[PDB]
Amino acid sequence: SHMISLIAALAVDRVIGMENAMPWNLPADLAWFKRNTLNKPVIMGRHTWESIGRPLPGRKNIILSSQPGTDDRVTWVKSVDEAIAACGDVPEIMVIGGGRVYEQFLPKAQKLYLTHIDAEVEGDTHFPDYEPDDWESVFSEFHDADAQNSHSYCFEILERR
Ligand SMILES: CC1(C)N=C(N)N=C(N)N1c1ccc(Cl)cc1
């Protein structure tokens, strides 16, 4: 319980956020994001918060920030532990981004939800490295590009050994 999970969209190990046009260009990824975070508390960094400016609905929105909070619809915190504790007694906590945020929660995470997008992005942010020998891949699902998804993509779920 209180299990920590990371959910990210990757183009060749580089982290994709709402700041880029591609998230919106892959509705299927968004549906996968909504499906796996519904009614779960989400933790995001300040920059991820700033790229949406409205809470994700039907979820406790926790913002890990090094600066004082600026929006009273979301819970602002200063540390990883403060973030974990703000989620309460729930089965699964979803860390949704910030490459730096991913890096800080990775050691506490037991589950990863990854979308591998067959696209190239020039962004300098990289998903943190995980030790293949400590992680097991338990689910993967390939999809071609189609009318609404401009790139092919493969969902993957890993769990810590
Ligand atoms: C939509 C997107 C890119 N898709 C996946 N699979 N992982 C995330 N963490 N995402 C995400 C969702 C919300 C926000 Cl605010 C940032 C990223």
PDB file of C-alpha atoms in Angstrom, residues 58-154:
ATOM      1  CA  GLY A  58     -11.121  13.929  -9.794  1.00  0.00           C
ATOM      2  CA  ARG A  59      -7.703  13.591  -8.158  1.00  0.00           C
ATOM      3  CA  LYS A  60      -5.722  15.047  -5.332  1.00  0.00           C
ATOM      4  CA  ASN A  61      -3.147  17.239  -7.119  1.00  0.00           C
ATOM      5  CA  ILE A  62       0.139  17.578  -5.155  1.00  0.00           C
ATOM      6  CA  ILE A  63       2.824  20.006  -6.431  1.00  0.00           C
ATOM      7  CA  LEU A  64       6.432  19.403  -5.346  1.00  0.00           C
ATOM      8  CA  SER A  65       7.850  22.919  -5.386  1.00  0.00           C
ATOM      9  CA  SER A  66      10.909  24.782  -4.161  1.00  0.00           C
ATOM     10  CA  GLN A  67       8.870  28.003  -4.068  1.00  0.00           C
ATOM     11  CA  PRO A  68       5.758  29.046  -2.139  1.00  0.00           C
ATOM     12  CA  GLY A  69       2.435  27.920  -3.547  1.00  0.00           C
ATOM     13  CA  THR A  70       0.383  30.138  -5.863  1.00  0.00           C
ATOM     14  CA  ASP A  71      -2.946  28.261  -6.262  1.00  0.00           C
ATOM     15  CA  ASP A  72      -5.231  27.135  -3.443  1.00  0.00           C
ATOM     16  CA  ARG A  73      -6.868  24.319  -5.481  1.00  0.00           C
ATOM     17  CA  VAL A  74      -3.773  22.098  -5.152  1.00  0.00           C
ATOM     18  CA  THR A  75      -1.520  20.961  -2.314  1.00  0.00           C
ATOM     19  CA  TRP A  76       1.972  22.461  -2.271  1.00  0.00           C
ATOM     20  CA  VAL A  77       4.864  20.578  -0.656  1.00  0.00           C
ATOM     21  CA  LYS A  78       8.603  20.969  -0.211  1.00  0.00           C
ATOM     22  CA  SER A  79       9.956  17.412  -0.030  1.00  0.00           C
ATOM     23  CA  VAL A  80       9.416  13.915  -1.343  1.00  0.00           C
ATOM     24  CA  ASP A  81       8.209  12.717   2.049  1.00  0.00           C
ATOM     25  CA  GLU A  82       5.804  15.632   2.390  1.00  0.00           C
ATOM     26  CA  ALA A  83       4.487  14.692  -1.059  1.00  0.00           C
ATOM     27  CA  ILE A  84       4.020  11.024  -0.137  1.00  0.00           C
ATOM     28  CA  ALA A  85       2.247  11.910   3.072  1.00  0.00           C
ATOM     29  CA  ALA A  86      -0.106  14.414   1.441  1.00  0.00           C
ATOM     30  CA  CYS A  87      -1.610  11.532  -0.564  1.00  0.00           C
ATOM     31  CA  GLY A  88      -2.992   9.801   2.496  1.00  0.00           C
ATOM     32  CA  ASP A  89      -4.113   6.190   2.835  1.00  0.00           C
ATOM     33  CA  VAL A  90      -4.370   5.208  -0.837  1.00  0.00           C
ATOM     34  CA  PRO A  91      -3.197   2.050  -2.648  1.00  0.00           C
ATOM     35  CA  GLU A  92      -1.194   3.764  -5.409  1.00  0.00           C
ATOM     36  CA  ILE A  93       0.417   7.208  -5.808  1.00  0.00           C
ATOM     37  CA  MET A  94       1.061   8.458  -9.361  1.00  0.00           C
ATOM     38  CA  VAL A  95       4.122  10.624 -10.077  1.00  0.00           C
ATOM     39  CA  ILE A  96       3.384  12.289 -13.394  1.00  0.00           C
ATOM     40  CA  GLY A  97       6.390  14.276 -14.245  1.00  0.00           C
ATOM     41  CA  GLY A  98       9.175  16.547 -14.132  1.00  0.00           C
ATOM     42  CA  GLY A  99      12.264  14.644 -15.189  1.00  0.00           C
ATOM     43  CA  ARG A 100      13.710  15.987 -11.949  1.00  0.00           C
ATOM     44  CA  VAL A 101      10.584  14.818 -10.130  1.00  0.00           C
ATOM     45  CA  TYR A 102      10.917  11.364 -11.725  1.00  0.00           C
ATOM     46  CA  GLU A 103      14.522  11.231 -10.555  1.00  0.00           C
ATOM     47  CA  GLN A 104      13.546  11.991  -6.959  1.00  0.00           C
ATOM     48  CA  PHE A 105      10.794   9.348  -6.716  1.00  0.00           C
ATOM     49  CA  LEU A 106      12.437   6.578  -8.745  1.00  0.00           C
ATOM     50  CA  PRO A 107      14.173   5.029  -5.687  1.00  0.00           C
ATOM     51  CA  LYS A 108      10.822   4.877  -3.884  1.00  0.00           C
ATOM     52  CA  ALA A 109       8.855   3.503  -6.862  1.00  0.00           C
ATOM     53  CA  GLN A 110       7.658  -0.089  -7.358  1.00  0.00           C
ATOM     54  CA  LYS A 111       5.876   0.376 -10.707  1.00  0.00           C
ATOM     55  CA  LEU A 112       6.536   2.256 -13.974  1.00  0.00           C
ATOM     56  CA  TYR A 113       4.017   3.074 -16.728  1.00  0.00           C
ATOM     57  CA  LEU A 114       5.945   3.983 -19.874  1.00  0.00           C
ATOM     58  CA  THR A 115       4.751   5.030 -23.339  1.00  0.00           C
ATOM     59  CA  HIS A 116       7.487   4.454 -25.928  1.00  0.00           C
ATOM     60  CA  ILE A 117       6.764   6.815 -28.821  1.00  0.00           C
ATOM     61  CA  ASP A 118       8.514   6.205 -32.129  1.00  0.00           C
ATOM     62  CA  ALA A 119       9.342   9.879 -32.616  1.00  0.00           C
ATOM     63  CA  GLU A 120      12.425  12.108 -32.188  1.00  0.00           C
ATOM     64  CA  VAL A 121      12.284  15.112 -29.792  1.00  0.00           C
ATOM     65  CA  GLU A 122      15.153  17.612 -29.210  1.00  0.00           C
ATOM     66  CA  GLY A 123      14.249  18.341 -25.542  1.00  0.00           C
ATOM     67  CA  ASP A 124      17.217  17.951 -23.147  1.00  0.00           C
ATOM     68  CA  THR A 125      15.156  16.328 -20.325  1.00  0.00           C
ATOM     69  CA  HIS A 126      15.842  12.578 -19.947  1.00  0.00           C
ATOM     70  CA  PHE A 127      13.956   9.911 -18.010  1.00  0.00           C
ATOM     71  CA  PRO A 128      16.098   8.724 -15.088  1.00  0.00           C
ATOM     72  CA  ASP A 129      18.032   5.535 -15.612  1.00  0.00           C
ATOM     73  CA  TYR A 130      16.769   2.323 -14.054  1.00  0.00           C
ATOM     74  CA  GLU A 131      18.791  -0.819 -13.355  1.00  0.00           C
ATOM     75  CA  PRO A 132      17.354  -3.427 -15.762  1.00  0.00           C
ATOM     76  CA  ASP A 133      18.278  -6.175 -13.288  1.00  0.00           C
ATOM     77  CA  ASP A 134      16.001  -4.654 -10.607  1.00  0.00           C
ATOM     78  CA  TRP A 135      12.979  -4.186 -12.898  1.00  0.00           C
ATOM     79  CA  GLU A 136      10.713  -6.707 -14.606  1.00  0.00           C
ATOM     80  CA  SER A 137       8.602  -5.924 -17.640  1.00  0.00           C
ATOM     81  CA  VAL A 138       5.117  -7.344 -17.053  1.00  0.00           C
ATOM     82  CA  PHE A 139       3.018  -5.724 -19.827  1.00  0.00           C
ATOM     83  CA  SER A 140       3.655  -4.220 -23.264  1.00  0.00           C
ATOM     84  CA  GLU A 141       1.283  -3.190 -26.055  1.00  0.00           C
ATOM     85  CA  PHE A 142       2.289  -1.902 -29.507  1.00  0.00           C
ATOM     86  CA  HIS A 143       0.084   0.381 -31.609  1.00  0.00           C
ATOM     87  CA  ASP A 144       0.699   1.702 -35.109  1.00  0.00           C
ATOM     88  CA  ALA A 145       0.096   5.329 -35.988  1.00  0.00           C
ATOM     89  CA  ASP A 146      -3.381   5.989 -37.322  1.00  0.00           C
ATOM     90  CA  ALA A 147      -5.720   8.879 -38.075  1.00  0.00           C
ATOM     91  CA  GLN A 148      -5.583  10.364 -34.592  1.00  0.00           C
ATOM     92  CA  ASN A 149      -2.106   9.237 -33.456  1.00  0.00           C
ATOM     93  CA  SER A 150       0.648  10.658 -35.633  1.00  0.00           C
ATOM     94  CA  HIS A 151       3.299   8.241 -34.350  1.00  0.00           C
ATOM     95  CA  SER A 152       3.378   4.590 -33.424  1.00  0.00           C
ATOM     96  CA  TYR A 153       3.750   3.863 -29.707  1.00  0.00           C
ATOM     97  CA  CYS A 154       4.112   0.981 -27.246  1.00  0.00           C
TER      98      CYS A 154
END
